[PDB]
PDB file of all heavy atoms in Angstrom:
ATOM      1  N   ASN H   1     111.812 106.582  82.618  1.00 55.20           N
ATOM      2  CA  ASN H   1     110.433 107.056  82.555  1.00 55.20           C
ATOM      3  C   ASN H   1     109.794 106.747  81.205  1.00 55.20           C
ATOM      4  O   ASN H   1     108.572 106.613  81.122  1.00 55.20           O
ATOM      5  CB  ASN H   1     110.363 108.560  82.846  1.00 55.20           C
ATOM      6  CG  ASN H   1     110.536 108.878  84.326  1.00 55.20           C
ATOM      7  OD1 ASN H   1     110.534 107.980  85.166  1.00 55.20           O
ATOM      8  ND2 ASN H   1     110.651 110.156  84.653  1.00 55.20           N
ATOM      9  N   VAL H   2     110.588 106.629  80.138  1.00 53.45           N
ATOM     10  CA  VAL H   2     110.011 106.271  78.842  1.00 53.45           C
ATOM     11  C   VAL H   2     109.681 104.786  78.811  1.00 53.45           C
ATOM     12  O   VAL H   2     108.619 104.384  78.327  1.00 53.45           O
ATOM     13  CB  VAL H   2     110.947 106.646  77.679  1.00 53.45           C
ATOM     14  CG1 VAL H   2     110.214 106.446  76.350  1.00 53.45           C
ATOM     15  CG2 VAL H   2     111.421 108.059  77.838  1.00 53.45           C
ATOM     16  N   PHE H   3     110.594 103.951  79.313  1.00 54.96           N
ATOM     17  CA  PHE H   3     110.329 102.520  79.412  1.00 54.96           C
ATOM     18  C   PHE H   3     109.090 102.255  80.251  1.00 54.96           C
ATOM     19  O   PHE H   3     108.261 101.403  79.908  1.00 54.96           O
ATOM     20  CB  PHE H   3     111.538 101.811  80.026  1.00 54.96           C
ATOM     21  CG  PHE H   3     112.598 101.452  79.028  1.00 54.96           C
ATOM     22  CD1 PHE H   3     113.287 102.436  78.343  1.00 54.96           C
ATOM     23  CD2 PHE H   3     112.903 100.131  78.783  1.00 54.96           C
ATOM     24  CE1 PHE H   3     114.261 102.093  77.412  1.00 54.96           C
ATOM     25  CE2 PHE H   3     113.873  99.777  77.865  1.00 54.96           C
ATOM     26  CZ  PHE H   3     114.553 100.765  77.185  1.00 54.96           C
ATOM     27  N   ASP H   4     108.954 102.973  81.362  1.00 55.92           N
ATOM     28  CA  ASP H   4     107.854 102.779  82.302  1.00 55.92           C
ATOM     29  C   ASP H   4     106.601 103.498  81.799  1.00 55.92           C
ATOM     30  O   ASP H   4     106.187 104.546  82.303  1.00 55.92           O
ATOM     31  CB  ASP H   4     108.266 103.272  83.681  1.00 55.92           C
ATOM     32  CG  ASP H   4     107.203 103.042  84.713  1.00 55.92           C
ATOM     33  OD1 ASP H   4     106.314 102.201  84.467  1.00 55.92           O
ATOM     34  OD2 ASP H   4     107.237 103.703  85.775  1.00 55.92           O
ATOM     35  N   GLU H   5     105.972 102.886  80.792  1.00 57.38           N
ATOM     36  CA  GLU H   5     104.846 103.516  80.113  1.00 57.38           C
ATOM     37  C   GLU H   5     103.719 103.851  81.082  1.00 57.38           C
ATOM     38  O   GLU H   5     103.214 104.979  81.096  1.00 57.38           O
ATOM     39  CB  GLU H   5     104.354 102.603  78.991  1.00 57.38           C
ATOM     40  CG  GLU H   5     103.081 103.086  78.324  1.00 57.38           C
ATOM     41  CD  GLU H   5     102.959 102.641  76.882  1.00 57.38           C
ATOM     42  OE1 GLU H   5     103.210 101.454  76.587  1.00 57.38           O
ATOM     43  OE2 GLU H   5     102.611 103.492  76.039  1.00 57.38           O
ATOM     44  N   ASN H   6     103.312 102.887  81.900  1.00 58.80           N
ATOM     45  CA  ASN H   6     102.199 103.094  82.819  1.00 58.80           C
ATOM     46  C   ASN H   6     102.615 103.834  84.082  1.00 58.80           C
ATOM     47  O   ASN H   6     101.770 104.064  84.950  1.00 58.80           O
ATOM     48  CB  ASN H   6     101.542 101.755  83.185  1.00 58.80           C
ATOM     49  CG  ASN H   6     102.368 100.939  84.155  1.00 58.80           C
ATOM     50  OD1 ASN H   6     103.538 101.230  84.396  1.00 58.80           O
ATOM     51  ND2 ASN H   6     101.756  99.909  84.726  1.00 58.80           N
ATOM     52  N   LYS H   7     103.888 104.209  84.194  1.00 59.36           N
ATOM     53  CA  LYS H   7     104.372 105.109  85.235  1.00 59.36           C
ATOM     54  C   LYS H   7     104.133 104.558  86.636  1.00 59.36           C
ATOM     55  O   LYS H   7     103.915 105.323  87.582  1.00 59.36           O
ATOM     56  CB  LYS H   7     103.734 106.495  85.106  1.00 59.36           C
ATOM     57  CG  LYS H   7     104.137 107.246  83.852  1.00 59.36           C
ATOM     58  CD  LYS H   7     105.600 107.652  83.919  1.00 59.36           C
ATOM     59  CE  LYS H   7     106.021 108.445  82.693  1.00 59.36           C
ATOM     60  NZ  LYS H   7     105.801 107.680  81.435  1.00 59.36           N
ATOM     61  N   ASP H   8     104.209 103.238  86.801  1.00 63.38           N
ATOM     62  CA  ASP H   8     104.015 102.637  88.114  1.00 63.38           C
ATOM     63  C   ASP H   8     105.318 102.379  88.856  1.00 63.38           C
ATOM     64  O   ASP H   8     105.299 101.723  89.901  1.00 63.38           O
ATOM     65  CB  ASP H   8     103.211 101.339  88.000  1.00 63.38           C
ATOM     66  CG  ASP H   8     103.897 100.280  87.168  1.00 63.38           C
ATOM     67  OD1 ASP H   8     105.034 100.502  86.714  1.00 63.38           O
ATOM     68  OD2 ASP H   8     103.309  99.202  86.982  1.00 63.38           O
ATOM     69  N   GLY H   9     106.436 102.890  88.359  1.00 64.55           N
ATOM     70  CA  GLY H   9     107.698 102.777  89.054  1.00 64.55           C
ATOM     71  C   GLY H   9     108.487 101.521  88.773  1.00 64.55           C
ATOM     72  O   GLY H   9     109.542 101.330  89.385  1.00 64.55           O
ATOM     73  N   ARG H  10     108.013 100.647  87.889  1.00 65.63           N
ATOM     74  CA  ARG H  10     108.769  99.456  87.534  1.00 65.63           C
ATOM     75  C   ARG H  10     108.628  99.190  86.041  1.00 65.63           C
ATOM     76  O   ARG H  10     107.614  99.532  85.416  1.00 65.63           O
ATOM     77  CB  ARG H  10     108.314  98.226  88.319  1.00 65.63           C
ATOM     78  CG  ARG H  10     106.870  97.849  88.077  1.00 65.63           C
ATOM     79  CD  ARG H  10     106.473  96.573  88.785  1.00 65.63           C
ATOM     80  NE  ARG H  10     105.100  96.223  88.440  1.00 65.63           N
ATOM     81  CZ  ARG H  10     104.032  96.854  88.912  1.00 65.63           C
ATOM     82  NH1 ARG H  10     104.141  97.855  89.777  1.00 65.63           N
ATOM     83  NH2 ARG H  10     102.824  96.477  88.505  1.00 65.63           N
ATOM     84  N   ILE H  11     109.670  98.594  85.475  1.00 66.47           N
ATOM     85  CA  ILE H  11     109.672  98.145  84.091  1.00 66.47           C
ATOM     86  C   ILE H  11     109.408  96.643  84.098  1.00 66.47           C
ATOM     87  O   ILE H  11     110.216  95.855  84.606  1.00 66.47           O
ATOM     88  CB  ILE H  11     111.001  98.475  83.404  1.00 66.47           C
ATOM     89  CG1 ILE H  11     111.220  99.990  83.333  1.00 66.47           C
ATOM     90  CG2 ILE H  11     111.057  97.864  82.009  1.00 66.47           C
ATOM     91  CD1 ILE H  11     112.636 100.377  82.944  1.00 66.47           C
ATOM     92  N   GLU H  12     108.270  96.245  83.545  1.00 63.94           N
ATOM     93  CA  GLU H  12     107.938  94.845  83.345  1.00 63.94           C
ATOM     94  C   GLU H  12     108.401  94.415  81.959  1.00 63.94           C
ATOM     95  O   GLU H  12     108.763  95.233  81.113  1.00 63.94           O
ATOM     96  CB  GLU H  12     106.437  94.632  83.527  1.00 63.94           C
ATOM     97  CG  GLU H  12     105.980  94.838  84.969  1.00 63.94           C
ATOM     98  CD  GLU H  12     104.475  94.694  85.152  1.00 63.94           C
ATOM     99  OE1 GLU H  12     103.715  95.038  84.222  1.00 63.94           O
ATOM    100  OE2 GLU H  12     104.048  94.235  86.234  1.00 63.94           O
ATOM    101  N   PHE H  13     108.397  93.109  81.721  1.00 64.18           N
ATOM    102  CA  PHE H  13     108.954  92.642  80.458  1.00 64.18           C
ATOM    103  C   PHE H  13     108.200  93.218  79.271  1.00 64.18           C
ATOM    104  O   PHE H  13     108.796  93.504  78.227  1.00 64.18           O
ATOM    105  CB  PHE H  13     108.941  91.120  80.367  1.00 64.18           C
ATOM    106  CG  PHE H  13     109.486  90.605  79.068  1.00 64.18           C
ATOM    107  CD1 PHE H  13     110.819  90.822  78.747  1.00 64.18           C
ATOM    108  CD2 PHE H  13     108.687  89.922  78.175  1.00 64.18           C
ATOM    109  CE1 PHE H  13     111.338  90.375  77.555  1.00 64.18           C
ATOM    110  CE2 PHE H  13     109.203  89.458  76.978  1.00 64.18           C
ATOM    111  CZ  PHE H  13     110.538  89.689  76.671  1.00 64.18           C
ATOM    112  N   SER H  14     106.879  93.323  79.386  1.00 65.76           N
ATOM    113  CA  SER H  14     106.091  93.844  78.277  1.00 65.76           C
ATOM    114  C   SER H  14     106.536  95.249  77.898  1.00 65.76           C
ATOM    115  O   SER H  14     106.576  95.599  76.712  1.00 65.76           O
ATOM    116  CB  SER H  14     104.610  93.836  78.646  1.00 65.76           C
ATOM    117  OG  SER H  14     104.358  94.709  79.733  1.00 65.76           O
ATOM    118  N   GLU H  15     106.854  96.075  78.896  1.00 65.89           N
ATOM    119  CA  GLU H  15     107.321  97.429  78.619  1.00 65.89           C
ATOM    120  C   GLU H  15     108.736  97.413  78.043  1.00 65.89           C
ATOM    121  O   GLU H  15     109.047  98.168  77.116  1.00 65.89           O
ATOM    122  CB  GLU H  15     107.285  98.276  79.898  1.00 65.89           C
ATOM    123  CG  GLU H  15     105.887  98.690  80.393  1.00 65.89           C
ATOM    124  CD  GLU H  15     105.887  99.256  81.811  1.00 65.89           C
ATOM    125  OE1 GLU H  15     106.806  98.890  82.591  1.00 65.89           O
ATOM    126  OE2 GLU H  15     104.959 100.044  82.124  1.00 65.89           O
ATOM    127  N   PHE H  16     109.610  96.576  78.603  1.00 66.67           N
ATOM    128  CA  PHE H  16     110.979  96.445  78.109  1.00 66.67           C
ATOM    129  C   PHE H  16     111.004  96.050  76.636  1.00 66.67           C
ATOM    130  O   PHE H  16     111.662  96.704  75.817  1.00 66.67           O
ATOM    131  CB  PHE H  16     111.719  95.430  78.992  1.00 66.67           C
ATOM    132  CG  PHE H  16     113.067  95.011  78.468  1.00 66.67           C
ATOM    133  CD1 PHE H  16     114.201  95.758  78.746  1.00 66.67           C
ATOM    134  CD2 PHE H  16     113.196  93.848  77.736  1.00 66.67           C
ATOM    135  CE1 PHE H  16     115.441  95.362  78.272  1.00 66.67           C
ATOM    136  CE2 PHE H  16     114.427  93.441  77.262  1.00 66.67           C
ATOM    137  CZ  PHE H  16     115.552  94.198  77.536  1.00 66.67           C
ATOM    138  N   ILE H  17     110.265  95.007  76.270  1.00 64.97           N
ATOM    139  CA  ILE H  17     110.338  94.509  74.901  1.00 64.97           C
ATOM    140  C   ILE H  17     109.664  95.467  73.926  1.00 64.97           C
ATOM    141  O   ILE H  17     110.062  95.558  72.758  1.00 64.97           O
ATOM    142  CB  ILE H  17     109.723  93.102  74.832  1.00 64.97           C
ATOM    143  CG1 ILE H  17     110.052  92.430  73.499  1.00 64.97           C
ATOM    144  CG2 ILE H  17     108.209  93.157  75.006  1.00 64.97           C
ATOM    145  CD1 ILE H  17     111.508  92.054  73.346  1.00 64.97           C
ATOM    146  N   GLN H  18     108.636  96.188  74.367  1.00 65.19           N
ATOM    147  CA  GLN H  18     108.013  97.167  73.481  1.00 65.19           C
ATOM    148  C   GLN H  18     108.977  98.303  73.169  1.00 65.19           C
ATOM    149  O   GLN H  18     109.073  98.745  72.019  1.00 65.19           O
ATOM    150  CB  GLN H  18     106.727  97.716  74.099  1.00 65.19           C
ATOM    151  CG  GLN H  18     105.965  98.661  73.181  1.00 65.19           C
ATOM    152  CD  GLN H  18     105.622  98.032  71.846  1.00 65.19           C
ATOM    153  OE1 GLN H  18     105.809  98.640  70.795  1.00 65.19           O
ATOM    154  NE2 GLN H  18     105.109  96.810  71.883  1.00 65.19           N
ATOM    155  N   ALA H  19     109.704  98.782  74.180  1.00 65.66           N
ATOM    156  CA  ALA H  19     110.679  99.846  73.964  1.00 65.66           C
ATOM    157  C   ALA H  19     111.769  99.399  72.998  1.00 65.66           C
ATOM    158  O   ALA H  19     112.141 100.133  72.078  1.00 65.66           O
ATOM    159  CB  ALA H  19     111.293 100.277  75.301  1.00 65.66           C
ATOM    160  N   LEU H  20     112.304  98.194  73.192  1.00 64.98           N
ATOM    161  CA  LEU H  20     113.340  97.707  72.289  1.00 64.98           C
ATOM    162  C   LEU H  20     112.793  97.481  70.886  1.00 64.98           C
ATOM    163  O   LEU H  20     113.499  97.726  69.905  1.00 64.98           O
ATOM    164  CB  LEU H  20     113.951  96.422  72.843  1.00 64.98           C
ATOM    165  CG  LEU H  20     115.150  96.658  73.763  1.00 64.98           C
ATOM    166  CD1 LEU H  20     114.980  97.853  74.672  1.00 64.98           C
ATOM    167  CD2 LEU H  20     115.399  95.394  74.593  1.00 64.98           C
ATOM    168  N   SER H  21     111.536  97.046  70.771  1.00 64.69           N
ATOM    169  CA  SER H  21     110.924  96.865  69.458  1.00 64.69           C
ATOM    170  C   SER H  21     110.859  98.186  68.697  1.00 64.69           C
ATOM    171  O   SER H  21     111.278  98.269  67.540  1.00 64.69           O
ATOM    172  CB  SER H  21     109.526  96.267  69.628  1.00 64.69           C
ATOM    173  OG  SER H  21     108.790  96.345  68.422  1.00 64.69           O
ATOM    174  N   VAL H  22     110.342  99.238  69.334  1.00 66.72           N
ATOM    175  CA  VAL H  22     110.191 100.526  68.666  1.00 66.72           C
ATOM    176  C   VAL H  22     111.556 101.140  68.377  1.00 66.72           C
ATOM    177  O   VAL H  22     111.821 101.608  67.270  1.00 66.72           O
ATOM    178  CB  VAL H  22     109.325 101.468  69.521  1.00 66.72           C
ATOM    179  CG1 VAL H  22     109.489 102.897  69.047  1.00 66.72           C
ATOM    180  CG2 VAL H  22     107.862 101.035  69.466  1.00 66.72           C
ATOM    181  N   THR H  23     112.443 101.142  69.371  1.00 64.87           N
ATOM    182  CA  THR H  23     113.718 101.823  69.176  1.00 64.87           C
ATOM    183  C   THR H  23     114.579 101.120  68.139  1.00 64.87           C
ATOM    184  O   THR H  23     115.372 101.777  67.457  1.00 64.87           O
ATOM    185  CB  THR H  23     114.482 101.946  70.499  1.00 64.87           C
ATOM    186  OG1 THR H  23     114.616 100.660  71.115  1.00 64.87           O
ATOM    187  CG2 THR H  23     113.768 102.916  71.435  1.00 64.87           C
ATOM    188  N   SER H  24     114.432  99.806  67.982  1.00 63.91           N
ATOM    189  CA  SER H  24     115.324  99.049  67.114  1.00 63.91           C
ATOM    190  C   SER H  24     114.737  98.746  65.742  1.00 63.91           C
ATOM    191  O   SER H  24     115.499  98.628  64.774  1.00 63.91           O
ATOM    192  CB  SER H  24     115.721  97.726  67.777  1.00 63.91           C
ATOM    193  OG  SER H  24     114.687  96.765  67.672  1.00 63.91           O
ATOM    194  N   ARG H  25     113.410  98.617  65.620  1.00 62.34           N
ATOM    195  CA  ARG H  25     112.818  98.187  64.359  1.00 62.34           C
ATOM    196  C   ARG H  25     111.632  99.033  63.915  1.00 62.34           C
ATOM    197  O   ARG H  25     110.965  98.669  62.941  1.00 62.34           O
ATOM    198  CB  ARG H  25     112.382  96.723  64.454  1.00 62.34           C
ATOM    199  CG  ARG H  25     113.546  95.753  64.462  1.00 62.34           C
ATOM    200  CD  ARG H  25     113.128  94.303  64.613  1.00 62.34           C
ATOM    201  NE  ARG H  25     114.287  93.489  64.964  1.00 62.34           N
ATOM    202  CZ  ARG H  25     114.257  92.177  65.156  1.00 62.34           C
ATOM    203  NH1 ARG H  25     113.146  91.476  64.985  1.00 62.34           N
ATOM    204  NH2 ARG H  25     115.371  91.552  65.528  1.00 62.34           N
ATOM    205  N   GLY H  26     111.353 100.146  64.580  1.00 61.57           N
ATOM    206  CA  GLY H  26     110.215 100.956  64.206  1.00 61.57           C
ATOM    207  C   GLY H  26     110.483 101.848  63.010  1.00 61.57           C
ATOM    208  O   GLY H  26     111.616 102.053  62.571  1.00 61.57           O
ATOM    209  N   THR H  27     109.393 102.367  62.449  1.00 59.22           N
ATOM    210  CA  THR H  27     109.509 103.394  61.428  1.00 59.22           C
ATOM    211  C   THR H  27     110.287 104.578  61.985  1.00 59.22           C
ATOM    212  O   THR H  27     110.426 104.744  63.193  1.00 59.22           O
ATOM    213  CB  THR H  27     108.126 103.858  60.967  1.00 59.22           C
ATOM    214  OG1 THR H  27     107.340 104.214  62.108  1.00 59.22           O
ATOM    215  CG2 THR H  27     107.410 102.769  60.189  1.00 59.22           C
ATOM    216  N   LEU H  28     110.787 105.423  61.085  1.00 57.49           N
ATOM    217  CA  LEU H  28     111.391 106.667  61.545  1.00 57.49           C
ATOM    218  C   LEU H  28     110.377 107.477  62.341  1.00 57.49           C
ATOM    219  O   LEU H  28     110.728 108.114  63.337  1.00 57.49           O
ATOM    220  CB  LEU H  28     111.928 107.490  60.371  1.00 57.49           C
ATOM    221  CG  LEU H  28     112.537 108.839  60.784  1.00 57.49           C
ATOM    222  CD1 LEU H  28     113.759 108.665  61.668  1.00 57.49           C
ATOM    223  CD2 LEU H  28     112.876 109.650  59.537  1.00 57.49           C
ATOM    224  N   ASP H  29     109.103 107.439  61.931  1.00 56.46           N
ATOM    225  CA  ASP H  29     108.053 108.137  62.666  1.00 56.46           C
ATOM    226  C   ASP H  29     107.916 107.572  64.078  1.00 56.46           C
ATOM    227  O   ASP H  29     107.851 108.325  65.056  1.00 56.46           O
ATOM    228  CB  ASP H  29     106.729 108.032  61.900  1.00 56.46           C
ATOM    229  CG  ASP H  29     105.578 108.676  62.637  1.00 56.46           C
ATOM    230  OD1 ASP H  29     105.613 109.909  62.846  1.00 56.46           O
ATOM    231  OD2 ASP H  29     104.643 107.939  63.009  1.00 56.46           O
ATOM    232  N   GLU H  30     107.905 106.239  64.212  1.00 57.10           N
ATOM    233  CA  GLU H  30     107.768 105.638  65.538  1.00 57.10           C
ATOM    234  C   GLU H  30     108.979 105.939  66.406  1.00 57.10           C
ATOM    235  O   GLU H  30     108.848 106.147  67.617  1.00 57.10           O
ATOM    236  CB  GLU H  30     107.570 104.132  65.413  1.00 57.10           C
ATOM    237  CG  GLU H  30     106.179 103.719  64.975  1.00 57.10           C
ATOM    238  CD  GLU H  30     106.088 102.252  64.632  1.00 57.10           C
ATOM    239  OE1 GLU H  30     106.990 101.750  63.936  1.00 57.10           O
ATOM    240  OE2 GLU H  30     105.119 101.589  65.049  1.00 57.10           O
ATOM    241  N   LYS H  31     110.169 105.951  65.805  1.00 56.54           N
ATOM    242  CA  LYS H  31     111.388 106.182  66.571  1.00 56.54           C
ATOM    243  C   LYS H  31     111.467 107.618  67.059  1.00 56.54           C
ATOM    244  O   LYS H  31     111.900 107.871  68.190  1.00 56.54           O
ATOM    245  CB  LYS H  31     112.615 105.837  65.723  1.00 56.54           C
ATOM    246  CG  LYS H  31     112.830 104.351  65.494  1.00 56.54           C
ATOM    247  CD  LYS H  31     113.828 104.094  64.367  1.00 56.54           C
ATOM    248  CE  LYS H  31     114.146 102.612  64.225  1.00 56.54           C
ATOM    249  NZ  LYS H  31     115.499 102.264  64.737  1.00 56.54           N
ATOM    250  N   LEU H  32     111.063 108.569  66.216  1.00 53.80           N
ATOM    251  CA  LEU H  32     111.036 109.964  66.638  1.00 53.80           C
ATOM    252  C   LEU H  32     109.993 110.184  67.728  1.00 53.80           C
ATOM    253  O   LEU H  32     110.224 110.951  68.676  1.00 53.80           O
ATOM    254  CB  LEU H  32     110.770 110.862  65.431  1.00 53.80           C
ATOM    255  CG  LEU H  32     111.919 110.992  64.419  1.00 53.80           C
ATOM    256  CD1 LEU H  32     111.444 111.673  63.155  1.00 53.80           C
ATOM    257  CD2 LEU H  32     113.075 111.759  65.045  1.00 53.80           C
ATOM    258  N   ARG H  33     108.844 109.506  67.615  1.00 51.00           N
ATOM    259  CA  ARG H  33     107.830 109.571  68.662  1.00 51.00           C
ATOM    260  C   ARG H  33     108.384 109.095  69.995  1.00 51.00           C
ATOM    261  O   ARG H  33     108.057 109.656  71.048  1.00 51.00           O
ATOM    262  CB  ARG H  33     106.613 108.740  68.258  1.00 51.00           C
ATOM    263  CG  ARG H  33     105.732 109.409  67.225  1.00 51.00           C
ATOM    264  CD  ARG H  33     104.690 108.471  66.644  1.00 51.00           C
ATOM    265  NE  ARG H  33     103.794 109.207  65.765  1.00 51.00           N
ATOM    266  CZ  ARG H  33     102.791 109.959  66.199  1.00 51.00           C
ATOM    267  NH1 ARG H  33     102.521 110.072  67.491  1.00 51.00           N
ATOM    268  NH2 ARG H  33     102.038 110.610  65.319  1.00 51.00           N
TER     269      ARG H  33
END
C-alpha cells in the first residue's frame, strides 16, 4: 500500500523506483516520512 501511491491496486515502475529512491537515498526526514 505504500508503494501503491495512487492506490489503484498496482505498482507501476514510476512508483517502484520512487519508493526505492526515498528508502535508499533520502534524507532521514524523507525516510521517516
